Amino acid sequence: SLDKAVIARLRKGGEEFEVLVDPYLARDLKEGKEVNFEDLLAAEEVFKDAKKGERASVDELRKIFGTDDVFEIARKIILEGEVQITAEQRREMLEAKRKQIINFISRNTIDPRTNAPHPPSRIERALEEAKVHIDIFKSVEAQVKDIVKALKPILPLKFEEMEIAIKIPPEHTGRAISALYNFGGVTREEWQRDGSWICVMRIPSGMYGDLMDLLGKVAKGEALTKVLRRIG
């Protein structure tokens, strides 16, 4: 457990405080995700020096932090202090967050020229071309508008959604409906008396081609669709 933990540290009131944490769950906490605090800490203790094992006293924690709750002090140390992740952990977390940003951009934007998504490897090249800084302690949603703005000089792209009305003939509902719910975005669904089924899919516009491919498979080319609206 403790070859795996890293130090998170904070100076407060002229004293140094440290906790020993799982670096991957500390990143999740800094990004804003819910975290199980029993897995996050390698020891339910606040240290003055985690390496020498010097523990902060209850009286000192009460004086400085106004509380003795180790979990709540650990949260403050991690959010306001520095997490000493290793260089290799930082590289691994950076590569993973970059991948998620690229995929999110690919799925949720379209090229205004061609009205189609760019491939992930096109977004990746543009990220490097633009020298985009990626923040491993922020969620995708928290940083993807800024990134997309930095990309627009070299790669035009725009966030857009579509609403698409769908009708599935009775013959194909068994396969089609389940597939559509799993794809996501089903709204205003309604069974019809003749066995057919209708809905309005609300999807990211860069998912349009995937949705049409899906309907070709699950409805054998028999589904009827109508583009209702594009939403910028």
Type and span of the H or E element at 110:
strand 109-110
User: What one-letter code names the amino acid at 117?
Assistant: P
- Count CB atoms within 10 A of the CB of residue 97: 20
Nearest CA to 206 among 101, 100, 118, 126? 118
For residues 10 and 5, give the distance between their C-alpha atoms in angstroms, rounded to a whole number.
Answer: 16
Type and span of the H or E element at 37:
helix 37-40
List of residues 6+ apart from 202 with CB closer than 8 A: 161, 162, 163, 185, 187
Nearest CA to 21 among 76, 84, 92? 84
Distances (CA, A) of 122 to 23, 93, 170, 205: 31, 21, 41, 17
Whether residue 227 contacts residue 162, with contact meaning beta carbons closer than 8 Å, is answered with yes
Q: Which CATH class is domain 5-84?
A: alpha beta
Bridge partners (DSSP) listed for residue 56: none
Judge residue 150's burial from the number of C-beta atoms within 10 Å of its C-beta, 0-12 exposed, 13-18 middle, 19 or more buried.
Answer: middle
CATH of 85-159, one of 1.10.1200.10, 1.20.1090.10, 1.10.10.900, 2.60.40.10: 1.10.10.900
Whether residue 222 contacts residue 190, with contact meaning beta carbons closer than 8 Å, is answered with no
For residues 38 and 46, give the distance between their C-alpha atoms in angstroms, rounded to a whole number.
Answer: 14
Work out whether strand 54-55 and strand 197-204 pair parallel, antiparallel, or are unpaired. Answer: unpaired
Nearest CA to 156 among 131, 134, 126? 126
3-state secondary structure of 82: strand
Whether residue 105 contacts residue 144, with contact meaning beta carbons closer than 8 Å, is answered with yes
85-159 matches 160-232 in fold = no
Domain layout of the chain by residue ranges: 5-84, 85-159, 160-232
Type and span of the H or E element at 30:
helix 23-31
For residues 117 and 206, give the distance between their C-alpha atoms in angstroms, rounded to a whole number.
Answer: 5
In the numeric block, the tokens 């794809």 are attached to: 183
For residues 212 and 30, give the distance between their C-alpha atoms in angstroms, rounded to a whole number.
Answer: 38
Check whether domain 160-232 has CATH 3.40.50.1460, yes or no: no
229 token code pair: 């609206």
